Amino acid sequence: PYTVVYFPVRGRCAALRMLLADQGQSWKEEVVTVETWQEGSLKASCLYGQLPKFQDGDLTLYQSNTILRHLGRTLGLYGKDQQEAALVDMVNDGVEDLRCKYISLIYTNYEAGKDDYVKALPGQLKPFETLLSQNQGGKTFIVGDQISFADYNLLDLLLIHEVLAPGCLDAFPLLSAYVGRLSARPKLKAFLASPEYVNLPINGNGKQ
Amino acid sequence: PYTVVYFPVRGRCAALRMLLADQGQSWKEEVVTVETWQEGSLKASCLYGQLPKFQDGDLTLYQSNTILRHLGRTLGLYGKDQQEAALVDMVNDGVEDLRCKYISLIYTNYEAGKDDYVKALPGQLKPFETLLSQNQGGKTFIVGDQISFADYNLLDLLLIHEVLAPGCLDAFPLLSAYVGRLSARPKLKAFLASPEYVNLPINGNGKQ
Numbered sequence A, B: 001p002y003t004v005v006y007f008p009v010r011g012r013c014a015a016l017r018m019l020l021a022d023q024g025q026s027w028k029e030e031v032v033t034v035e036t037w038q039e040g041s042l043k044a045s046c047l048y049g050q051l052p053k054f055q056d057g058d059l060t061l062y063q064s065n066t067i068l069r070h071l072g073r074t075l076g077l078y079g080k081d082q083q084e085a086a087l088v089d090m091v092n093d094g095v096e097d098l099r100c101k102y103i104s105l106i107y108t109n110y111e112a113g114k115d116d117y118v119k120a121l122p123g124q125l126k127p128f129e130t131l132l133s134q135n136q137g138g139k140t141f142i143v144g145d146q147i148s149f150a151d152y153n154l155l156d157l158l159l160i161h162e163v164l165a166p167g168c169l170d171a172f173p174l175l176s177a178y179v180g181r182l183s184a185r186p187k188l189k190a191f192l193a194s195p196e197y198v199n200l201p202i203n204g205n206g207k208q
């Protein structure tokens, strides 16, 4: 089945967990404590010396986006054709780019950079509002009329930014409605409300 | 029916150009000068305000990795099955991570950071040598027995690092042989030796 090996935080596993939950998939959580990680052996066995580590049978994967694409590919959440698949990648790449800036702020310089980051936020979110407006008026998903792995990753990105900058989605009606709509999906709603998700910190350094 | 819109540098288009050339594909180059870019209109029309922009018929793509995955998917350079496809993604994600560090060094802190970067390089290259050793003794490609988009991206990464740190591949026999081998592919060899590639700077700020 599936096993996700990660630190006791949402971080880069939040999106893939939402995907698994919403798709009614069963998985195992292997929690890595800071003490275990600092021991060194685990880190050394990780391909790029990082987590998450993912196991699907005897297939061992590293890199959050590789895991998302793998699940999207095997679970049929990667567009209806090659054209949609490319657009899904384009959205995910954009989500990844903003995620990198977010992580840099959180772990590198939260105190000094928070204000500039928040001022620049609207410009960073606009592309996703635009994509939504060009797809069935933003009434369905980020790409096409079926959910994709990019939806889960984008949803997570939006959720964590609302925590960082409450109200950042007020200027974007499509993204706002999108978050509410996806968050309302039965299995996803149940997961997002569960202790498994709720009692885990977004990040590892206590900042959000 | 392919069109690459980019600045007059190799940068993030080097790998996809190598792919197109080696696969015997025809494409058009739309060069964007710094003056044109600074005018603002083009940038504003780009999804994430960045290049490269790619056109395949009426499909317009942004993000170098989206373009690579699109071409890999449509040209059959994405593994023989889902398992290999995941491995290809894992390699490409790793290449992207090192590329980001490389770009950061080149554009934001070349002078002061070059030494630390080069010292850390072997550790960054090791994962790729390891992947190679686990696949047919590193005699074929990075994943499986057929070329993938990840090979072109990794090859580019290796080539630009040889320029940055001559001899960095001396400690990695599989990667060294890999570079020589792939660079020897007829169409790729011809392209790499052509003015089209040779007369373009690796980066935009004159550093390499």
Ligand SMILES: C=C(CC)C(=O)c1ccc(OCC(=O)O)c(Cl)c1Cl
Pocket: A007, A009, A011, A012, A033, A034, A037, A103, A107, A203, A204, A205
């Ligand atoms: C070092 C840590 C404890 C083992 C830590 O707190 C930490 C640092 C960076 C991180 O992500 C970085 C990313 O790029 O996602 C994460 Cl997820 C954690 Cl938990």
Ligand SMILES: C=C(CC)C(=O)c1ccc(OCC(=O)O)c(Cl)c1Cl
Pocket: B007, B009, B011, B012, B033, B034, B037, B103, B107, B203, B204, B205
């Ligand atoms: C600003 C420039 C001229 C229009 C410039 O020189 C420049 C800066 C960053 C770049 O890549 C960044 C990357 O992330 O790939 C590139 Cl490819 C260029 Cl040409």
